[PDB]
């Protein structure tokens, strides 16, 4: 029996688009019926690859990889935006967290997760790109920020670029979305001094 995504794409469903709440990710499926979103504009890396890997799964599950009210004490997690509105009210992805400054500081961020699900874990995150350097300071305070995501099989360092861009859905900023598969027993480590759209919920699954 297939996975019914209704009016949402894989991106909107996997990212947790607020308009895909009632969608339910059943424990296993053979294929995905779809209607091809990302309410915050940006680039979803290896999107077609992900659609292929999620094409048929067993033992699928959505779990809380970094609890919102514990994992980030020294950062603000309540960031919402009108680009991802729900019920005429600004909101944000249900599987991600927009980390911003708290009390005028954005302390160096470091958090890690060990895969104890005995299955493959799909982790997704984002990198946010303001359009001017003043706002970069206001939101994250460091001018030359970095984001680092490392596992035993994945390693990448993201540098945000500050550029004036045309408005998309009324937004001049951008959030690029990335993902990786975490093998059982492996550890993934997130490090940043800004611009990290942190994983809030993640997914554990057996492929095929």
């Amino acid at each position: 029996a297939p996975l019914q995504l209704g009016n949402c794409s894989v991106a909107g469903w996997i990212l947790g688009n607020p308009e895909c709440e009632s969608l339910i990710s059943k424990e296993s499926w053979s294929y995905i019926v779809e209607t091809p979103g990302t309410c915050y504009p940006g680039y979803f890396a290896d999107y077609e690859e992900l659609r292929e890997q999620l094409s048929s799964v067993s033992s699928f599950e959505r779990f809380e990889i970094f609890p919102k009210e514990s994992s980030w004490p020294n950062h603000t997690v309540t960031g919402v935006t009108a680009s991802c509105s729900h019920n005429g009210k600004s909101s944000f992805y249900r599987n991600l967290l927009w980390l911003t400054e708290k009390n005028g500081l954005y302390p160096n961020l470091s958090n890690s997760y060990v895969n104890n699900k005995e299955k493959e874990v799909l982790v997704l995150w984002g990198v946010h790109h303001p359009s001017n350097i003043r706002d970069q300071r206001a939101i994250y305070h460091t001018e030359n920020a970095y984001v680092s995501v490392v596992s035993s099989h994945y390693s990448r360092r993201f540098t945000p670029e500050i550029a004036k861009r045309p408005k998309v859905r009324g937004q001049e900023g951008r959030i690029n979305y990335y993902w990786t598969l975490l093998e059982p027993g492996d550890t993934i480590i997130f490090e940043a001094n800004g611009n990290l759209i942190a994983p809030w919920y993640a997914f554990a699954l057996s492929r095929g």
Epitope: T100, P130, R134, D135
Partner: antibody, heavy 130, light 109 residues
Framework: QVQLQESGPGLVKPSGTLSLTCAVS?????????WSWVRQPPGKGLEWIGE???????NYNPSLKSRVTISVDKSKNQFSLKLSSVTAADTAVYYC???????????????????????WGKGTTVTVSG | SELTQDPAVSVALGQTVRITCQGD??????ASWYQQKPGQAPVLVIY???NRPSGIPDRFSGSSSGNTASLTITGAQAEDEADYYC????????????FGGGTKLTVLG
């Protein structure tokens, strides 16, 4: 529970310089806030004077720019206001207040598109007279 | 630019009144509202949109549409008789802060 309190002379001679200091307590000025000054002439509305960041960068009312100076002093947890060449038009109740951070572009969360002054000083009356 | 609001309006005891604030600056920044009584400092009643500070009664609500922000008072009480200023940040230049002229609210009855 930040609280503000103005202080300074209640009388300033014409062509003189008004000097007020706002004492900040219950919190640190080193923060993400815009420490602001507001005034209200007798029987008139509110007029924004200027704001200052703890770094020392300032943003002033254009109509008062060439007479206004707003300073910050982290040694005493205070910020101050100086207004030169005062006339009868500068007689007013002066308030110091606290504003939140903001963004100039549409690339920030909604919290950075508010403007308000939530905490206010009790206000101190300044009258310009000989 | 500037924020323009009616300088005076009346409302009967227990009725509902909507005070309007207009200005192109409201297209990119949220409008806050203050209540002021003679001899007292302004008191913030709306942070922006429809968020009230702690201690502000529920009958003070905020809405907006276009370049117009509105403060609605449902069931006006005697103590609501005061001046109401709208306030936002200019969207041009160095973004100076702008105040509305204020609205003097008379509570009849």
């Amino acid at each position: 529970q930040v609280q503000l309190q103005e202080s300074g002379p209640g009388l300033v001679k014409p062509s003189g310089t008004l000097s007020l200091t706002c004492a900040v307590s219950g919190g640190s000025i080193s923060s993400s806030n815009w420490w602001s000054w507001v005034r209200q002439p007798p029987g008139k509305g509110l007029e924004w004077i200027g704001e200052i960041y703890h770094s020392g960068s300032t943003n002033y009312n254009p109509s008062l720019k060439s007479r206004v100076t707003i300073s910050v002093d982290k040694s005493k947890n205070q910020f101050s206001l100086k207004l030169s060449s005062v006339t009868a038009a500068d007689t007013a109740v002066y308030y110091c207040a606290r504003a939140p951070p903001y963004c100039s572009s549409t690339s920030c969360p909604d919290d950075y598109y508010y403007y308000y002054m939530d905490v206010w000083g009790k206000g101190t009356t300044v009258t310009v007279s000989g | 630019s500037e924020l323009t609001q009616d300088p005076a309006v009346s409302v009967a005891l227990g009725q509902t009144v909507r005070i309007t604030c207009q200005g192109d600056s409201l297209r990119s920044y949220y409008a806050s509202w203050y209540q002021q009584k003679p001899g007292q400092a302004p008191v913030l009643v709306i942070y922006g949109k429809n968020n009230r500070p702690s201690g502000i009664p529920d009958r003070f609500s905020g809405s907006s549409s276009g370049n117009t922000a509105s403060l609605t008072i449902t069931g006006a009480q005697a103590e609501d008789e005061a001046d109401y200023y709208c306030n936002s940040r200019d969207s041009s230049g160095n973004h100076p802060v702008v105040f509305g002229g204020g609205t003097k609210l008379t509570v009849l009855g």
